[PDB]
Amino acid sequence: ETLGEKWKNRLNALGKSEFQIYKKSGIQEVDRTLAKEGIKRGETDHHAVSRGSAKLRWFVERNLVTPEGKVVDLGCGRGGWSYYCGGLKNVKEVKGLTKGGPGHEEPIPMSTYGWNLVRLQSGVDVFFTPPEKCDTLLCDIGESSPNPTVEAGRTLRVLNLVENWLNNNTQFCIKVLNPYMPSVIEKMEALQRKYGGALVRNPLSRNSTHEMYWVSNASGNIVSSVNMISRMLINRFTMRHKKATYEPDVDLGSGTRNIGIESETPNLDIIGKRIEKIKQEHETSWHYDQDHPYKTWAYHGSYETKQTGSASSMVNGVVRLLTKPWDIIPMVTQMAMTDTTPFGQQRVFKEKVDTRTQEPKEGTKKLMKITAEWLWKELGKKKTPRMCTREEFTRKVRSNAALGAIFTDENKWKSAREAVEDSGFWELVDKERNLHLEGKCETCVYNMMGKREKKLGEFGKAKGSRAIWYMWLGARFLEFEALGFLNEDHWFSRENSLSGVEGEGLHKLGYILRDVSKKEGGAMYADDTAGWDTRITLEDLKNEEMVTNHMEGEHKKLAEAIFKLTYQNKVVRVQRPTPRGTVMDIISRRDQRGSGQVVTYGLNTFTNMEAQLIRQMEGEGVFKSIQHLTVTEEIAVKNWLVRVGRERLSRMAISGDDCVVKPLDDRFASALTALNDMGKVRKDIQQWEPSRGWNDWTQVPFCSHHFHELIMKDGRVLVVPCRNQDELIGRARISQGAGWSLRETACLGKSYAQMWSLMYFHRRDLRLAANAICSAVPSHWVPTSRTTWSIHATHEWMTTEDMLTVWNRVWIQENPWMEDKTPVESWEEIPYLGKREDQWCGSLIGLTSRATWAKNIQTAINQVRSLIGNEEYTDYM
């Protein structure tokens, strides 16, 4: 055997104290006495995540390897190497992969210099990933083991994995585990002959390992280097113990880095006045930034502001101390708090908003044009457009109705109600209306904010990581005046349009689904779309603008001005952390969907209906090619619409972007050409993989609900909504931020503790949890607060009388599908959701979990209710 084997055997034959003292016998260390506790406090700059950053700095400083262009990282883990590389000058993009899981290193987020170029991926195995184009490859995978043969096998496997990715002109820095046996030297010789390099040891590396690294800009011999390293290791344990040479840690600073590519052009003639006014308002601190991280948006400037927002969110204390056994479920605690600091907003904006789509072809354009024209002619058969006034808006604002996301212009007034009565507000509104009537806009800007930036929260909060657009009050009033009739007249009701479900309560969609599933055809398909709000192109906006053909006069002029100057020409402010403090930038864009909530809902419903109709057109085989549409097809496609067009719209149900379709023939799943061409890419499925259908209507997900069916004691049959109990409990423990008191939080708790008694009465673990809240609140208080479900325009559980009469009125008297009208007079005749199904849906009954759901029951809940304090109440259980 070689000298390395002797050294390994000698190190194996050693004592514990001798082994501990042998580790530091001349090596160099870095003082981590600051960075660790800085990271623990929550710092996100001027720090190094791990120790490999110093080693990589040592390698780069002596230009042993010079990364450039795109850099691929294997087994990054926390990602010290990738984070250090991102701050370099010649690096344009960093991509890294690691294998996560139990007992493995995981990436954590930092905001160091150039943090907007680094993307890390987790839970991917490198051995089963096809190679891609790369310019510099880094590999630092290796695990020690007492046996030499297993280490040699691991090294050979690593080399076999790595040999495929390398090209002729790619830089590399690869770690080799055990280099002192011929079983690796024979391969190393061929590899060095083919590609070049050498084996060099890092002085920072510990004294307990024989590690070596393979680099690019070096040369020499392998066996001689290994022998000399072994000789040095042998000689090492012969001198005295020398103190470790301490070296200060690396500091990286903070900021954002720009790549330098732009793919957008501005229209100065439309937004010049707005830009000039905004610049003139803040002339004192106006400056140009050269490090804007925007690629598909324009840039104009930046000024100074004060930081707003805070990580995490307030927690409703009234609902807490009642749901005691739920403090240990990871889902409840994780989704409870989100991030809305400028760092989180920048992260969301980089991750989702900044994208780019592609233009469709001629045939799809003609198809959607024809379909949109026919649909607009069909809907407006029994309705006429009109114009809104000021009294209706005043009544809307006075009643605290479901207004959209809007800031109340806090600089001068304090709330919308306080500003409505004033006259200066109306004077400004009139001036802006006069300006808009001549095809100019001057005070129409937006605001942006982010939310939902945790790991498990996005899987249980509708669609997470969203972005809401605020607007000034005057623009809101102008938009309402222009296009209020689409919602004030119920254009998208089920009676008028045979597909929409607007105006229908949450307790009625199950009946609609059951009625739909009674037809003849194939199976039910419930595919969805990811990021629907960002997949809208200019062509769709132009198609939706075709509603003005039914208008006239001043109404038509105002609608045209609103459509042209606002919806497809936007100006948006956003915040961004900088070393000098906090700043606000202004950007612009043509595409995408930004408007009020109700208008967005209506337009999305219309576009979804048109897209579903086009896909059903393609499924039936009316037309064959989408690249170009010819004659004898336009006539054929128009005949299909006239003949059975109305009936085919009755097979669907489209609330927002959620759709359910029952086609005549199962050829629906194989028609994925027009849908992919338009830009509505599906979610979590392969691009060309056929979709999966359902043969049962009790499992189809619609509006994040699965609809069961129940049987009363008498024999009557109902249909009830359902959901995962964990999500409801997690939502129920979050205060929206309208508290800072006990009365407010108690009112909110009582307000949305009645939704469970109304809709989710069929499950054991939720009906009981509402009686405690009703018996703890002192009653006599109005439970007025917006809870959730802004789309559902019922909000019926806000009343004050006893819930039994309300239940009897809602589920019996006003039920079209219920024949008999004999009411009930007790809470004991209402049945439950079985026993096993309750556990499956997420309850805590029937098994060992009943042993911990044994103190949150009437056995030990009376003390919990009394724990509230001097605040009186009234028993109800």
Binding site: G101, P102, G103, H104, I328, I329, P330, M331, Q334, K455, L456, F459, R692, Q699, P701, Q839, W840, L847, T848, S849, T852
Partner: protein, 290 residues
Amino acid sequence: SQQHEIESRILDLRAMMEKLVKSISQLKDQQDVFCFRYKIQAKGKTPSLDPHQTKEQKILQETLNELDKRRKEVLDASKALLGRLTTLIELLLPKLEEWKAQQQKDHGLEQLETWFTAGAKLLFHLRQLLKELKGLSCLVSYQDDPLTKGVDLRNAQVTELLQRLLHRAFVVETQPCMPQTPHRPLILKTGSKFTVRTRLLVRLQEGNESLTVEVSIDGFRKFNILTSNQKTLTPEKGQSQGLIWDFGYLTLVEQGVTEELHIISFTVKYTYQGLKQELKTDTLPVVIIS
């Protein structure tokens, strides 16, 4: 100064040990909930392709990650406990080494015995906590479990430290002297009774098993103990007054005069919490005169 430092140390150790107990309990409840959830998922027996199945498996992985985070959090706190605890014993060691120097050259023992009893209680409760932690984690031990070696190394270290402490925990309070003439100590006379007193620094003893102490002595003038060399201490005696041993009637008989000395040896068998250790100690040299 040293005593106040010891009191502050033991107070902070008790506080963080209570915190560790709370963390252990919380981990136990979380593990129980995860086990129940996996059981109910498995008994469902629904193999198919569904988003709900894809949803539940993702949240199952997150639960496993949290279990590892909690499990790894226990060890370092226990490891940090051992390091700080190891400082107290080596600091308290010279307090006993200098204690015997004065005897060879007020003689209260309350502070030392209280400190030793507190340390023994801490060690025993830590050992029991590690044992129950191992018993809990043996149920769902799986791949990549650092506990499967960490808990064993921790028990080994705890046992070694306890053995080292109990090796020095035995001291002789009083040398054998005659009650008639206490003026001359450490002197022996043939055919006479002698009074000795030995105390053990830890005031811990099982309430159902009595404690047994034996004695032994040493052509030199070999002497044999004519009287009984064995005695038994009632378990309630340790609670009433402490582990006090009194042999007030021991006699020695014979089977220049002052050229070599004789040494009396003390041996105790300690049994508590399933651990048995053998201890031997020696008294001050004495000379026998006829």
